[PDB]
Amino acid sequence: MGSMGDTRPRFLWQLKFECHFFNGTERVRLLERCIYNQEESVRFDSDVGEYRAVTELGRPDAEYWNSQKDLLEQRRAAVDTYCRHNYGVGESFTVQRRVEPKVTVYPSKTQPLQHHNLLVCSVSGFYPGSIEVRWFRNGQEEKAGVVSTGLIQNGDWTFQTLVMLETVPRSGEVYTCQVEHPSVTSPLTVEWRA
Amino acid sequence: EEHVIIQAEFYLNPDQSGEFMFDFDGDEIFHVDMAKKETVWRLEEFGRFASFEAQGALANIAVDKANLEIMTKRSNYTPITNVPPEVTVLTNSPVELREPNVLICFIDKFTPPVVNVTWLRNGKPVTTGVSETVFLPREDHLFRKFHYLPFLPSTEDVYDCRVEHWGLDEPLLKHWEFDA
Amino acid sequence: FNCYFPLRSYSFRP
């Protein structure tokens, strides 16, 4: 058993400095988290202003660092010197990043029912993640028979999602996959004619 | 919230493996390559817009190693509990025959940050043009990772992403083939 | 330069 060799015990330490931003940079919270294996042990929360043990294993560290007044002063000012600074560094290509989805409609290769057409709307390559993907039959929004995969992160600063609709095609109908997204001022639409 | 920037670091023993990366809303801005001692931007344009002094990351990593060893002794060498990954294979766009595409191996919810990923084409390892991300942090302090294989879709080829991890008794084998 | 700043990590009590 075991899918990999070298099964010696492992020991992991993680440090996470989280800058949380509300309403641009009007409200900023710094959360410094120290994690041993899978358990946070001590943290500095800028809303608190000093280190606090999260587990007992972290109590000695909170006590020692809280005795170091230069460190505390630097960490308390980090919401400005660190969080707001780094926010301004990348604001134009992160906060303001907008990438338009590509929208494709096709029948599923799975067609389980005669006189039905299972349609797939693929929405790929977009940023940020907030999106609406909606099916229409003529001018009528379809709410029944819709399944979505939800957001999928691709790892390259784009997302994709898949939304399917079971249809009973009738002559004269047009089915539209319509996408609302911050990258476009008018919705993207792609049509499948019955 | 609207947005979060995370400076995420780790050190792992006995591997002597470190990582330093910046994260914006769950995507990687950059990491520092520990071997080349250089900043690696996740998207090429990022390196035209911004800079980061790699030596700052290396200095923190040395402290992380020291703190790891203190915590290892303080816990009486309590080791990490392996958590095996969840794996999904998908394409970055709808597949058309003979139109270049990319296979994505999506590896999620695992720790420690050590994994082995092999792309197989028709059961044979393939490496041409493959690429991968470093370990991305999760709020539950597990990790996520992406591996990529550019490919030319065809009706004859099949693919598998094979993922191995200390938490897996057997390798995970996730299949993809043309949806004919 | 347009520079990301890191926060420095500090050791436990020496």
Residue numbers in the entry:
A (entry chain B): -3 to 190
B (entry chain A): 3 to 182
C (entry chain C): 1 to 14
Give the exact sentences the study uses for this entry.
CD4+ T cells recognize a broad range of peptide epitopes of severe acute respiratory syndrome coronavirus 2 (SARS-CoV-2), which contribute to immune memory and limit COVID-19 disease. Analyzing six epitopes, some with very low binding affinity, we solve X-ray crystallographic structures of each bound to HLA-DR1. In summary, each peptide bound HLA-DR1 canonically in the “forward” orientation that is described for HLA-DR,48 excluding CLIP. We observed little deviation in the overall structure of HLA-DR1 irrespective of bound peptide, particularly within the peptide binding groove, where the solved diversity of bound peptides had little impact on the position of the HLA-DR1 residues that lined each pocket.
